[PDB]
Amino acid sequence: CDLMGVDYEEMAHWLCHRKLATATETYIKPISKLHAINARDALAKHIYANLFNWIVDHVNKALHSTVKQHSF
Amino acid sequence: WXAXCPA
């Protein structure tokens, strides 16, 4: 939470609970330790995949050129 | 009454 600059107790809450809302009203559920570990791993995978797509996008920024590509 | 009807 230091590295990412987020409130320790907010991450501490959301790692261990999940939230549902119907159209009107909203509920907060505890989750089992297995689902908490699965969720943390899925979050790590999601961060990594988005970081990868972002590095690829800045490489494309450097590789692109302004002339209209006729064919490749 | 007290709530519903008048008495």
Binding site: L20, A21, T22, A23, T24, Y27, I28, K29 | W1, X2, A3, X4, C5
Partner: protein
């Protein structure tokens, strides 16, 4: 692919949405109102009937009918209006295009599934349909293959033991106390303090009082003596017109009828002793796994303290070394819908639907053959 619609016809609410959603998109009271007064102003734009939240908003002008009571559909023209409103106005979806998973309470009449199928294929022309027992879905909703589900709606209460994915249909208890008979008892007792609520629109004030202020005693006689001896339990509420009404020991007394149905003159035992009597009909090898995994479901179990009172009062019945556990998720009001949403999205399920081809070949009797 096209999603299935998932629609649950409670007695009290309709929950509807699309399979794979985590929560229902439409929830509204399954109520139909008709105007009961002379139409004086010309050109206002009269309407023969309101449905759902429309009938809630106007309800001072309207007679409100519930078309399902005790999980039985008691007049079809209203129920067909309610479904019409569900598909076209709340979901805004062509029913031509989506399978519909309907839902039903166990052990109710067989003419109710036949009609409920006939109307889907003839009136709404749905491609394919299914009908599923309410208490089975709460296990999909709570991640379990074993448990005894206590489910209590507006109209019906039932226990369904399920072990390792096999239902035990001889042990299914159905009990006919529910939120609506709690509400009628609440009106009768409230009359003691002078408040009288008479009409169908006015009943639905009492329903909101019951939801907001009732709770279940952990010792009925001790809190009776307490509230007879102290103001500390006395709590107060505003009617729509701004009259304040004040409610005391009575607020725990109404959900106590779930544990003592004799208050309503109901001969049968309460939900605790029907749960224990359901486990005693199961084979002795599985009782240890049905003493854990008591799953609460449906709105009538939302009372504060009902899980604690259940655990306490089953533990007085079960042998001293069985671990009694009551499982009461905070979304248990929607858990039947959530489990229907899971069930309709499995790929193994897509063979189970009643397709219109089969209904054309067999006629509506097929619903008993191709279903639990």
């Amino acid at each position: 692919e096209t999603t299935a619609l998932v629609c649950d016809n409670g007695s009290g609410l309709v929950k509807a949405g699309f399979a794979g959603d985590d929560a229902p998109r439409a929830v509204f009271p399954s109520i139909v109102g008709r105007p009961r007064h002379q139409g004086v102003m010309v050109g206002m734009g009269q309407k023969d009937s309101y449905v759902g939240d429309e009938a809630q908003s106007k309800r001072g002008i309207l007679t409100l009918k519930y078309p399902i009571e005790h999980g039985i559909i008691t007049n079809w023209d209203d129920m067909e209006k309610i479904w019409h409103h569900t598909f076209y106005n709340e979901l805004r979806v062509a029913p031509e295009e989506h399978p519909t998973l309907l839902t039903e309470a166990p052990l109710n009449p067989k003419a109710n599934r036949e009609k409920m199928t006939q109307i889907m294929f003839e009136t709404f022309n749905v491609p394919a349909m299914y009908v599923a027992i309410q208490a089975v879905l709460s296990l999909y909703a709570s991640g379990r293959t074993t448990g005894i589900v206590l489910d209590s709606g507006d109209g019906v209460t039932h226990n369904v033991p399920i072990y390792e994915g096999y239902a035990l249909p001889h042990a299914i208890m159905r009990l006919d106390l529910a939120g609506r008979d709690l509400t009628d008892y609440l009106m009768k007792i409230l009359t003691e303090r002078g408040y009288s609520f008479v009409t169908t629109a006015e009943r639905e004030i009492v329903r909101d009082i019951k939801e907001k202020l009732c709770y279940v005693a952990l010792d009925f006689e001790n809190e009776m003596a307490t509230a007879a001896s102290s103001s500390s339990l006395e709590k107060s509420y505003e009617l729509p017109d701004g009259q304040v009404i004040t409610i005391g020991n009575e607020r725990f007394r109404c959900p106590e009828t779930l544990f003592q149905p004799s208050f309503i003159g109901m001969e049968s035992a309460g939900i605790h002793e029907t749960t224990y009597n359901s486990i005693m009909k199961c084979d002795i090898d599985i009782r240890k796994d049905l003493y854990a995994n008591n799953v609460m479901s449906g709105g009538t179990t939302m009372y504060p303290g009902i899980a604690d009172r259940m655990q306490k009062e089953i533990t007085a019945l079960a042998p001293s070394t069985m671990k009694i556990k009551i499982i009461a998720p905070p979304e248990r009001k929607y858990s039947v819908w959530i489990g229907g949403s899971i069930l309709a999205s499995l790929s193994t399920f897509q063979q189970m639907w009643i397709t219109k081809q089969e209904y054309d070949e067999a006629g509506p009797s097929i619903v008993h053959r191709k279903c639990f």
